[PDB]
Design an enzyme around this catalytic site. Structure first.
Site, PDB file in Angstrom:
ATOM      1  N   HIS A 212       0.859  -1.195   0.000  1.00  0.00           N
ATOM      2  CA  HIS A 212       0.000   0.000   0.000  1.00  0.00           C
ATOM      3  C   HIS A 212       0.898   1.249   0.000  1.00  0.00           C
ATOM      4  O   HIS A 212       1.819   1.395   0.801  1.00  0.00           O
ATOM      5  CB  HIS A 212      -0.896   0.013   1.238  1.00  0.00           C
ATOM      6  CG  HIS A 212      -0.077   0.173   2.524  1.00  0.00           C
ATOM      7  ND1 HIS A 212       0.311   1.294   3.111  1.00  0.00           N
ATOM      8  CD2 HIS A 212       0.394  -0.788   3.285  1.00  0.00           C
ATOM      9  CE1 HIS A 212       0.963   0.989   4.231  1.00  0.00           C
ATOM     10  NE2 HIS A 212       0.986  -0.327   4.365  1.00  0.00           N
ATOM     11  N   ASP A 216      -2.053   4.667  -4.490  1.00  0.00           N
ATOM     12  CA  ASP A 216      -3.360   4.000  -4.841  1.00  0.00           C
ATOM     13  C   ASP A 216      -3.342   2.911  -5.958  1.00  0.00           C
ATOM     14  O   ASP A 216      -2.301   2.437  -6.406  1.00  0.00           O
ATOM     15  CB  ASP A 216      -4.398   5.035  -5.347  1.00  0.00           C
ATOM     16  CG  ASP A 216      -3.790   5.714  -6.618  1.00  0.00           C
ATOM     17  OD1 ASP A 216      -2.658   5.373  -7.045  1.00  0.00           O
ATOM     18  OD2 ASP A 216      -4.360   6.720  -7.048  1.00  0.00           O
TER      19      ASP A 216
END
EC number: 2.3.1.12
Length: 239
Positions: A212, A216
């Protein structure tokens, strides 16, 4: 020992830890539990790279035996420079920080799974990439391969061309990063379906896990989209 996550039954003795099925399960748990990801899938055109690999068989003389591997290494090396993100162990002092470019490849041994690393700060000639294929291969057979004896990995490839890959992942530890598993893929782009039209149109497959990021799914998709473009025309790497 215990069915799953057991020490008796297993094929793993086995790289840094991993007594057996117990340890392999416990170790994988570390990666999956700390590393929230979502593999990304892309197929690329190597109708010419395969061609080039065959044509330069003579120059090789099985000095390294030109495998798609070294080509992918040089492929990922240049790409990593363009997109620094996911800097292993963060920092750096020179020059220009990012953090060199030391990539490791999985090497399934009777013991188990070793990922030897090949230096590279931002460079990897055909001979340097290939000079380690044979080197990593020999070490593999001699169980002299362990990232611990020279860790410092930025990204690692899992070539299982002996099958197929369409969106795969399973990152390891924060100190080491995973690139892209390889296995097969065919662009649904030999579009045509005409009596007179090229068909075609091959592909290798490229699946890449990723942590992550602030960025995004948009950034993730752009990365694969560019990786797609890069491998249809490897010449784009030259520019």
């Amino acid at each position: 020992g215990p069915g799953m996550a057991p020490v008796p039954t297993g094929v793993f003795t086995d790289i840094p830890i991993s007594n057996i099925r117990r340890v392999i399960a416990q170790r994988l748990m570390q990666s999956k539990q700390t590393i929230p990801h979502y593999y990304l899938s892309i197929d690329v055109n190597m109708g010419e790279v395969l061609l080039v690999r065959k044509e330069l068989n003579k120059i090789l003389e099985g000095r390294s035996k030109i495998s798609v591997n070294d080509f992918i290494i040089k492929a990922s090396a240049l790409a990593c420079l363009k997109v620094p993100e996911a800097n292993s162990s963060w920092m750096d002092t020179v020059i220009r920080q990012n953090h060199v470019v030391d990539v490791s490849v999985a090497v399934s041994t009777p013991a188990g799974l070793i990922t030897p690393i090949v230096f590279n700060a931002h460079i990897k000639g055909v001979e340097t990439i290939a000079n380690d294929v044979v080197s990593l291969a020999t070490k593999a057979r001699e169980g002299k391969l362990q990232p611990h004896e020279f860790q410092g990995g930025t990204f690692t490839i899992s070539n299982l061309g002996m099958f197929g890959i369409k969106n795969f992942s399973a990152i390891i530890n924060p100190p080491q990063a995973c690139i892209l598993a390889i296995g097969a893929s065919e662009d649904k782009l030999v579009p045509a379906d005409n009596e007179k039209g090229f068909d075609v149109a091959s592909m290798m497959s490229v699946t890449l896990s990723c942590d992550h990021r602030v960025v995004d799914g948009a950034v993730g998709a752009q990365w694969l989209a560019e990786f797609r473009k890069y491998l249809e025309k490897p010449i784009t790497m030259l520019l």
